[PDB]
């Protein structure tokens, strides 16, 4: 292993100071050590180059230090927009001697926030095709832990739903989740009440949103 990063992941609060370290086996050639920030679904972005030079436009809260085989990236006032995976990359004087570190994940802790819940019935176009997808949306909540329960005429559904969650938002550190319940058209048209119930730490009692087929 040529370049190790520590720790693998960390969490802190808005305004905290955090440090990530990067170690190489061989000494870096001509201060050639760079730091990259990668947000969800985006290309890496060069934050620091030559150990300590800030990319223009990068906030001054980022700083790099180190020498030879040991380097450090410091974020002095952690912000929601800093949620990301950070990679170090070093130059060792030639062809082939260059690799990335394994990366360090940075998450930000914030206050509890309850989700806003929405429900969407299947479109008539999709019902033409013989399938029915019902969608439940949980908007801008924290922490990530949340349970979604589908109910069809108050009968609990299981095995016929899938969900996904966004990464921490760049402005408010919250998550958002989407759950999809999939039924056949024949099974969909046998019942009337379609509801999604959401359980989150920010909600006194579970919040249910519902619609009646038609």
């Amino acid at each position: 292993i040529q370049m190790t990063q520590s720790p693998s992941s960390l969490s802190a609060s808005v305004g905290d100071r955090v440090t990530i370290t990067c170690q190489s086996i061989k000494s870096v050639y001509n201060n050639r050590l760079g730091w990259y920030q990668q947000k969800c679904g985006k290309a890496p972005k060069l934050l620091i180059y030559e150990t300590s030079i800030l990319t223009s436009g990068v906030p001054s809260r980022f700083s790099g230090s180190g020498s030879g085989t040991d380097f450090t990236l410091t974020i002095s006032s952690l912000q929601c927009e800093d949620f990301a995976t950070y990679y170090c990359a070093g130059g060792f004087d030639r062809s082939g001697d260059t690799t990335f570190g394994q990366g360090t994940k940075v998450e930000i802790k914030r206050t509890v926030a309850a989700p806003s819940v929405f429900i969407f019935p299947p479109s008539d176009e999709q019902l033409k095709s013989g399938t029915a997808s019902v969608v439940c949306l949980l908007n801008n909540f924290y922490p990530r832990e949340a349970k979604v329960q589908w109910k069809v005429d108050n009968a609990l559904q299981s095995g016929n739903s899938q969900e996904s969650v966004t990464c921490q938002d760049s402005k408010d550190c919250t998550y958002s989740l989407s759950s999809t319940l999939t039924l056949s058209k024949a099974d969909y048209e046998k019942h009337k009440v379609y509801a999604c119930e959401v359980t989150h730490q920010g909600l006194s009692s579970p919040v249910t949103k519902s619609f009646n087929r038609g």
Partner: protein, 205 residues
């Protein structure tokens, strides 16, 4: 506009030859140094190779026997060719500029393309169906293949605030589904580049 644009086929079958291009939008490729990097899903970054300002071409030890990196100045494109692909080659592929002109450096890649997703899988591409999520409002892009995710915008770029585009889900059928929502007090722009399918759906009550 973005300066570096990667382009590729999206979904390929195993043993095929993968051909990728990296087009520079507004600058001559003469003396322009570029680096190819890939990132498998959920994994770290991996160097493939690069070209220096002197057109000198460097290859990582693993790529030196299966990859060809070249330049076409008349077309303003760098080319990457990866022979006999397998599932181990599924990744997002990036080109990035080293402003110093170095051909084998990772410490100062100051400009990146957005990447081109490549999935190696023995099955044919399937374009999605786009359905409205009518009242927040959204679009459901359902039953597409391969994993390479669809891209979704709103109002052709205008609606950007409150927009949440969720990670795609792998359904039991093996096909992929994605949802994009927007919070409002409307047309979603879906592009499935593997199938070259572009659909703009108007969501209304």
């Amino acid at each position: 506009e973005v300066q570096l644009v990667e382009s590729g086929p999206g979904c390929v079958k195993p043993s095929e030859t993968l051909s990728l291009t990296c087009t520079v939008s507004r600058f001559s490729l003469i003396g322009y140094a570029i680096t190819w990097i890939r990132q498998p899903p959920g994994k770290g970054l991996e160097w493939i190779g690069g070209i220096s300002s002197a057109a000198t071409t460097f290859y990582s030890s693993w790529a030196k026997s299966r990859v060809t990196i070249s330049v076409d100045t008349s077309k303003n494109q760098f080319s990457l060719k990866l022979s006999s692909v397998t599932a181990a080659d599924t990744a997002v592929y990036y080109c990035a500029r080293d402003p110093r002109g170095y051909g084998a450096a990772l410490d100062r890649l100051d400009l990146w393309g957005q990447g081109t997703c490549v999935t190696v899988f023995s099955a044919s591409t399937k374009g999605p169906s786009v359905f409205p999520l009518a009242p927040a409002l959204g679009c459901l892009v359902k039953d597409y293949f391969c994993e390479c995710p669809v891209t979704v915008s709103w109002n052709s770029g205008a609606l950007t605030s409150g927009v949440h585009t969720f990670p795609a889900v792998l359904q039991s059928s093996g096909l992929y589904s994605l949802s994009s929502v927007v919070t409002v007090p409307y047309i979603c722009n879906v592009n499935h580049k593997p199938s070259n399918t572009k659909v703009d759906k108007k969501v209304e009550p």
